[PDB]
Amino acid sequence: DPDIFNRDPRDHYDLLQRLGGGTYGEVFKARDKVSGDLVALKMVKMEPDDDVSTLQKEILILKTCRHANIVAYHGSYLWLQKLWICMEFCGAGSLQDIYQVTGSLSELQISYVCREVLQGLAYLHSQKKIHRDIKGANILINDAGEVRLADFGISAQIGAELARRLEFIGTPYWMAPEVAAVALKGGYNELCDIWSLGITAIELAELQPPLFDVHPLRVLFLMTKSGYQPPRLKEKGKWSAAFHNFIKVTLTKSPKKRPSATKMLSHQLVSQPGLNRGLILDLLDKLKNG
Amino acid sequence: VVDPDIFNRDPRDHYDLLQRLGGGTYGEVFKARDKVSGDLVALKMVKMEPDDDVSTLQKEILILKTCRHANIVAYHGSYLWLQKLWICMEFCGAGSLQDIYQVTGSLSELQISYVCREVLQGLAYLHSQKKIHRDIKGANILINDAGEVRLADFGISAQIGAELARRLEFIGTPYWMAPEVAAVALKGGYNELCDIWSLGITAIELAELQPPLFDVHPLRVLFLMTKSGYQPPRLKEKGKWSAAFHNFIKVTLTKSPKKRPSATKMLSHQLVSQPGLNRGLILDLLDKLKN
């Protein structure tokens, strides 16, 4: 790929500190040596006997993605078999990091977050791209209180596996149509991000998604049973009917009836006036006071 | 561990390798003869390393040793020696139905009806054990010297099991995951009824010596099955086949998995329940092969 910078990222950036994990790779905070601007660098090591398809898909996803509510992609450096993905810096970290200090968010704060994530998802889905990993840990906040979607590692893995299973599909002349549809289209569509956002709205309201106490495998099994009920907000009178309805429609069980991102953006909870980053600046102020 | 019952010895202590089978189609399968008794077996060799992931093989052997049925190829055990695993199975002199019809030509309706009944019995057993074959085809249906029909090649089935095992060990935190995504993660997006469709295609293969659309690009064929107006394939020669055979093709090739009948249900279909079906039809096929 000619877009890759074939040089050492330390040519341009002072590495400052490790910021955490992600779906794969280590993320570093760094500073532009010329402008003094801050960035984050997701470093992915490519070891000798490694399939790099997932990494290549991640770069492919980001190369054509330009939307304010998606963490900006500035490019990638390949050096000493390490790929450094350079991106926009969001100084406050993830919402999950934040609410573990501040406590649960207010309804207006959640409404701003949901509106901003929905704007990002509409753009992503308009590119036939899926996030598939929406949660508080993947919603980043910068010092201005603005909302950014991050970590496409899961998205990239899904696209690489789909391309791989397709390349190694062999002769499908005996294959049933439902198997073929799964091989080409994966078994679901972008509306899974709308459900995840509804669960995130509960997360931000209650500091954990439903059934977080339950073993992950057990949770998978419960969601596939006939009696599975979409979760609800635990405290009824704490939240408006608009918030309850938002949760109800985003958590529609059938994907055939789950509304799209663009449709959800006309929902009154996220289309109401007065939603601005200042609501999140207030949250960041709670952080600043222990 | 690949299998607690592995024989930690070289199978060539006991067998002489006589010839490779499949010409690469079946992989490294070998006709082998017992050095002492002269009994013939099939040894399928798979190369192993320390770094090699053994999950698929482990699943394949688990399937073979736990799914003993009259219509599944017989499994005699596995040898591990010098980074080579050998799967020992019964030897079928005639090979697969594809081997046979490339010599004999198209099978008769009764012979195809008998194969379908026997395969459905094996599938009904497999599905009853929460197993999916997912690669039913003429090349994977063996005919032994006694004229018995036996499903084989559980490699795709093993792969599917190994993918599910890896998704669940690395499931992470699925608390934000949508129900339809959890269903695909857990159940794969389809069910054992895909095998019923594959048998319908196989019945056409045994009658015409090619599956429908064999001359169309594989990726093109895949896409067509996802288009709303996909018409399931039919038998070419209408006049050659009975109404029951056409209807059997119709029902197995129900494109909606919600309406496709199960293996046990399909066994009460008029075609595969008719009294004229007996092993002699296949022995007759073997007699034709021998001539």
Ligand SMILES: Cc1c(N)cncc1-c1cc2cc(Nc3cc4n(n3)CC(=O)N(C)CC4)ncc2c(N)c1F
């Ligand atoms: C079908 C198959 C798959 N798909 C994958 N892995 C193994 C087998 C598999 C093949 C067998 C083949 C034979 N015997 C014959 C006889 C002939 N062939 N093979 C082909 C050939 O080479 N000739 C020259 C024609 C006659 N016996 C037992 C087998 C067995 N137990 C298997 F599991």
Ligand SMILES: CNC(=O)c1c(C(N)=O)nc2n1[C@H]1C[C@H](C1)c1ccc(C#C[C@]3(O)CCN(C)C3=O)cc1-2
């Ligand atoms: C103060 N700040 C951060 O703690 C930050 C930023 C930050 N920018 O500030 N990022 C992370 N963290 C931490 C660590 C972890 C959360 C993480 C994990 C994965 C990704 C990613 C990614 C991409 O797939 C590649 C490029 N791109 C636009 C993606 O989405 C970013 C981050």
Ligand code: NA
């Ligand atoms: Na072979």
